[PDB]
Amino acid sequence: RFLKVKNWETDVVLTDTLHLKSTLETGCTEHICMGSIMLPVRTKDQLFPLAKEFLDQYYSSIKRFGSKAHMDRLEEVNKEIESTSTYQLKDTELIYGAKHAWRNASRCVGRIQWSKLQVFDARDCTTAHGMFNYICNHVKYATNKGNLRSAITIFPQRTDGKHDFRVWNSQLIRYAGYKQPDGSTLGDPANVQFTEICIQQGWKAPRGRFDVLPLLLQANGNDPELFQIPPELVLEVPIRHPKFDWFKDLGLKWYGLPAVSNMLLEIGGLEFSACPFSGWYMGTEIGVRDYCDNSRYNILEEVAKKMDLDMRKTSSLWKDQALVEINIAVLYSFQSDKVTIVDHHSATESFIKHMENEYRCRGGCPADWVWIVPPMSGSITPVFHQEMLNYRLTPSFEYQPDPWNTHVWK
Amino acid sequence: RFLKVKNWETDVVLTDTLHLKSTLETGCTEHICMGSIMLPTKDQLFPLAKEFLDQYYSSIKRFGSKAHMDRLEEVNKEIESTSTYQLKDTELIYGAKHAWRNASRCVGRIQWSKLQVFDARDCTTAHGMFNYICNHVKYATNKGNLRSAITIFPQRTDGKHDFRVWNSQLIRYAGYKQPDGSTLGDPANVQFTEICIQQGWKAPRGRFDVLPLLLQANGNDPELFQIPPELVLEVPIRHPKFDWFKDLGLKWYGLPAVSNMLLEIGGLEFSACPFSGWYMGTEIGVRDYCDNSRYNILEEVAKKMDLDMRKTSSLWKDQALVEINIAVLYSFQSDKVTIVDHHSATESFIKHMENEYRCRGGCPADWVWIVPPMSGSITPVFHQEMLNYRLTPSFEYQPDPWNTHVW
Numbered sequence: 001r002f003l004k005v006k007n008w009e010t011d012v013v014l015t016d017t018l019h020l021k022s023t024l025e026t027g028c029t030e031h032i033c034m035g036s037i038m039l040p041v042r043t044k045d046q047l048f049p050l051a052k053e054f055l056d057q058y059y060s061s062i063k064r065f066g067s068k069a070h071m072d073r074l075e076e077v078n079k080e081i082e083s084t085s086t087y088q089l090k091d092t093e094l095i096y097g098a099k100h101a102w103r104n105a106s107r108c109v110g111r112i113q114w115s116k117l118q119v120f121d122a123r124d125c126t127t128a129h130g131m132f133n134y135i136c137n138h139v140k141y142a143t144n145k146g147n148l149r150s151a152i153t154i155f156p157q158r159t160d161g162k163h164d165f166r167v168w169n170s171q172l173i174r175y176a177g178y179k180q181p182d183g184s185t186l187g188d189p190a191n192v193q194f195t196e197i198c199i200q201q202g203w204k205a206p207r208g209r210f211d212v213l214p215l216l217l218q219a220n221g222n223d224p225e226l227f228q229i230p231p232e233l234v235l236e237v238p239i240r241h242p243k244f245d246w247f248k249d250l251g252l253k254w255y256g257l258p259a260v261s262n263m264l265l266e267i268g269g270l271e272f273s274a275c276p277f278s279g280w281y282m283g284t285e286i287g288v289r290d291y292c293d294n295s296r297y298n299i300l301e302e303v304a305k306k307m308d309l310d311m312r313k314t315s316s317l318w319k320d321q322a323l324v325e326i327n328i329a330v331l332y333s334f335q336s337d338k339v340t341i342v343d344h345h346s347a348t349e350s351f352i353k354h355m356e357n358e359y360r361c362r363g364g365c366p367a368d369w370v371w372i373v374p375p376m377s378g379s380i381t382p383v384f385h386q387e388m389l390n391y392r393l394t395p396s397f398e399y400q401p402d403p404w405n406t407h408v409w410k
Numbered sequence: 411r412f413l414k415v416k417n418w419e420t421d422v423v424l425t426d427t428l429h430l431k432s433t434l435e436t437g438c439t440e441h442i443c444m445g446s447i448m449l450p451t452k453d454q455l456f457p458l459a460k461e462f463l464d465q466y467y468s469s470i471k472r473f474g475s476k477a478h479m480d481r482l483e484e485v486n487k488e489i490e491s492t493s494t495y496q497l498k499d500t501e502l503i504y505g506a507k508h509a510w511r512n513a514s515r516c517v518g519r520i521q522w523s524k525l526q527v528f529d530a531r532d533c534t535t536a537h538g539m540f541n542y543i544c545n546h547v548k549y550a551t552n553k554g555n556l557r558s559a560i561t562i563f564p565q566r567t568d569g570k571h572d573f574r575v576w577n578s579q580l581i582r583y584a585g586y587k588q589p590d591g592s593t594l595g596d597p598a599n600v601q602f603t604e605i606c607i608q609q610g611w612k613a614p615r616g617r618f619d620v621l622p623l624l625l626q627a628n629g630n631d632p633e634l635f636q637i638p639p640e641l642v643l644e645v646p647i648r649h650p651k652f653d654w655f656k657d658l659g660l661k662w663y664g665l666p667a668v669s670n671m672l673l674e675i676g677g678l679e680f681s682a683c684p685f686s687g688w689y690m691g692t693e694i695g696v697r698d699y700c701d702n703s704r705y706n707i708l709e710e711v712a713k714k715m716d717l718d719m720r721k722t723s724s725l726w727k728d729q730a731l732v733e734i735n736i737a738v739l740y741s742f743q744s745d746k747v748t749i750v751d752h753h754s755a756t757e758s759f760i761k762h763m764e765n766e767y768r769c770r771g772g773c774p775a776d777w778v779w780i781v782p783p784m785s786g787s788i789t790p791v792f793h794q795e796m797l798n799y800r801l802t803p804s805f806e807y808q809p810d811p812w813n814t815h816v817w
């Protein structure tokens with residue numbers, strides 16, 4: 001088979017063959033497309049085949065397929081699975097797996113950096129305090145004083161599903177959200193529920209607008225525990241505008257390190273329920289979504305008012321106008337504090353190059369157009385005019401139920 | 411089965427059942443999503459006809475009635491004899507309105523039922539087509555107070571007597587390649603603009619030259635016609651705060667009228683069915699004006715705004731784009747020509763979606779196309795999950811007439 005993909009701005013056409021290897025489902029039938037849908041204990045028998053194909057890829061990637069080292073590793077793994085039911089990955093395999101989970105993330109526009117990933121092996125970790133230490137070292141290393149470095153910390157793989165390691169926070173660093181009895185929300189609305197669990201667990205909220213939440217860490221299936229990330233480790237950027245000297249008075253700021261912590265990493269059948277990973281922000285994530293979504297900080301009106309814009313009628317495009325300035329401010333601020341960050345133009349342009357490269361070296365690049373195209377100025381970024389094929393490849397990062405909706409408390 | 415759709419901004423969940431009536435395939439499988447790909451007989455005809463009539467009568471609360479049954483046999487017998495059939499007026503009107511209603515890429519379907527239908531089925535020549543088209547352009551333009559409409563020429567028979575409108579839209583600017591190697595006018599129509607020259611049209615070689623209509627009737631060869639200039643309402647683009655804007659020398663037409671698609675009703679194929687409504691701002695401001703492959707004007711507009719175009723991180727492109735779309739909307743409103751902005755259009759569509767879900771049990775929607783090409787996440791449709799599937803009657807793409815015609 002062969003599937004063609006065309007870019008309507010360059011007339012460039014690409015041939016995808018990589019999709020042939022996709023085994024997982026898409027949520028789409030032949031009679032329906034669910035492309036815009038947000039979220040559409042393995043047994044030993046189910047496990048070996050998964051390990052095999054994975055190990056086949058690995059060895060193939062190091063140009064040693066069929067070798068003796070390859071066969072013996074298969075024999076070694078098969079045996080281990082039969083006797084122990086599970087199986088431990090080699091350090092080289094773990095690093096290969098993680099980079100590929102990233103490499104296969106169809107919703108990630110920053111994959112051009114996929115091979116530059118620092119992997120921290122936290123498989124010997126046994127307690128929550130242990131997880132805390134590991135996370136602090138990840139935050140410090142990745143931040144690097146503003147010169148951000150991609151990194152991922154991998155805790156023990158799931159066993160019987162009763163001794164899972166979970167990082168309850170959705171991101172290592174995030175601002176608390178509090179619901180007021182008057183119905184309004186102070187802080188970040190998106191984190192209200194998690195904030196409550198933290199308070200309910202003993203956290204003492206400063207009840208402010210940008211309070212870095214504490215970590216809630218679950219080790220070996222035990223009840224989660226609270227820890228406060230060392231402030232001197234949480235790099236933040238106050239947001240000011242290059243021309244609007246009143247912007248700083250808006251009292252805005254954001255953290256510099258985006259580190260996802262609620263996803264599950266799958267490598268050769270194994271499941272790593274705790275695998276926080278971080279990179280660096282694309283401006284629009286903060287400028288458009290975090291600040292302007294109606295269900296987030298929702299700063300449009302206040303930014304507009306101060307800009308003195310005709311807010312009487314939408315057709316004046318006051319919302320659009322204010323959005324640009326706000327995103328202007330985010331990029332400017334980060335660049336001024338020498339904290340890594342990329343704008344949607346550069347990010348989407350690099351992604352197009354990475355995508356083409358991937359087609360010519362792997363035979364494809366699974367991509368989710370709904371997620372790749374930026375939440376602003378969509379059509380003036382190259383990805384918009386790019387047809388994409390979305391399919392599933394492992395290793396991979398997946399979502400998992402929120403830990404508070406499944407955890408069996410002790 | 412029973413699929414649900416959630417809006418992540420309001421948490422509202424709607425259940426979709428309408429998809430269970432999907433006929434055609436989407437191009438997507440369980441192994442791959444083709445969502446962003448722009449385009450993935452007596453025995454055949456009667457079932458389709460029955461499906462349609464069934465829906466029609468169901469809508470008029472006469473499902474099963476003798477009328478329903480009689481009509482069914484009548485068509486059945488007609489197909490057995492004439493190897494095809496004709497729609498009664500009522501069924502044509504319904505068919506066309508419903509083709510619009512099922513257009514998963516149209517953001518303005520909230521207007522679906524308010525569609526004027528012009529039966530051009532008695533047309534036999536190109537001059538006739540021209541007459542029908544002119545009256546359509548005039549009725550729909552209504553001096554700026556646009557009214558949606560569609561004109562339906564004779565349905566296909568043997569495929570060699572197909573009626574076709576070679577233009578992609580009734581009104582579009584010509585595209586000429588210059589000595590340089592660049593392009594004057596609209597790069598999107600360069601080829602058609604060539605087929606018009608290669609046909610006789612005397613191209614004035616201007617930036618915004620309204621192309622001539624190239625009509626084809628009963629499989630014959632296309633003929634050129636110049637739409638009465640008095641019938642082509644145009645808006646000169648000026649800015650509400652940049653009096654230098656007028657100097658960009660930009661203008662666009664007020665009437666968007668798609669004419670290269672094919673209308674299918676009850677198995678029947680109407681290869682010539684121009685339809686029009688009114689512009690959503692972004693269409694011109696973002697796509698026609700700023701698309702790199704189109705008029706690509708961001709370069710200059712930025713200059714004139716005196717902004718740092720040194721680093722992409724200054725978002726000068728974004729900055730310009732906004733002002734430009736301010737101007738388009740501003741101009742149209744000032745000349746009282748109908749136009750809608752992306753904020754209002756999308757808000758309207760969300761409401762339409764909510765009505766369609768409780769009245770029809772669903773609303774086919776293509777997210778990739780529904781979300782405006784600018785300020786995506788600040789419009790409601792961005793946070794709205796959508797289910798895409800095909801339903802007939804429908805509007806479909808069809809091969810360019812020049813790439814398939816036997817002169």
Ligand code: HEM
Nearest residue numbers: 102105107108109110113150151277278279280281282397
């Ligand atoms: C180097 C900086 C990086 C940039 C600029 C980048 C940018 C992005 C952006 C803009 C999104 C969408 C986020 C949202 O809308 O919530 C995304 C999604 C994603 N990225 Fe990256 N990324 C980078 C690094 C990484 C790293 C290091 C990994 C993994 C090791 C990764 C894995 C993912 C995944 C799994 C998704 C999709 C998640 C989902 O399906 O919900 N990214 N990335």
Ligand code: HEM
Nearest residue numbers: 510513515516517518521558559685686687688689690805
């Ligand atoms: C009255 C106001 C209308 C508005 C504001 C509206 C707006 C839109 C917009 C923004 C698009 C995208 C255009 C593009 O990107 O090329 C679109 C697509 C579409 N609209 Fe509407 N529309 C309206 C009327 C109509 C009418 C009267 C019909 C049919 C009778 C219709 C049929 C379609 C079709 C079929 C498409 C998608 C075509 C395809 O699949 O490529 N629209 N519309």
Ligand SMILES: C[C@H](O)[C@H](O)[C@H]1CNc2nc(N)[nH]c(=O)c2N1
Nearest residue numbers: 036037038370371792793794795
């Ligand atoms: C409903 C729709 O799927 C949803 O709003 C998606 C659209 N595209 C997105 N794209 C990115 N990068 N991030 C998101 O959260 C979303 N949300």
Ligand SMILES: C[C@H](O)[C@H](O)[C@H]1CNc2nc(N)[nH]c(=O)c2N1
Nearest residue numbers: 384385386387446447448778779
């Ligand atoms: C490649 C991608 O499908 C293509 O650029 C689509 C995206 N969304 C669109 N949406 C609308 N309304 N109109 C278009 O022409 C497109 N082009």
Ligand SMILES: CCS/C(N)=N\c1ccc(C(F)(F)F)cc1
Nearest residue numbers: 258259260277278279280281282
């Ligand atoms: C890993 C830091 S890379 C980055 N730029 N940000 C995000 C933010 C959210 C997600 C998601 F997983 F929540 F979608 C993914 C990447």
Ligand SMILES: CCS/C(N)=N\c1ccc(C(F)(F)F)cc1
Nearest residue numbers: 666667668685686687688689690
């Ligand atoms: C019918 C006028 S309704 C409108 N706003 N414009 C368009 C423009 C192009 C198309 C398309 F068919 F080319 F995609 C559809 C609608």
Ligand SMILES: [Zn+2]
Nearest residue numbers: 028033438443
């Ligand atoms: Zn799909």
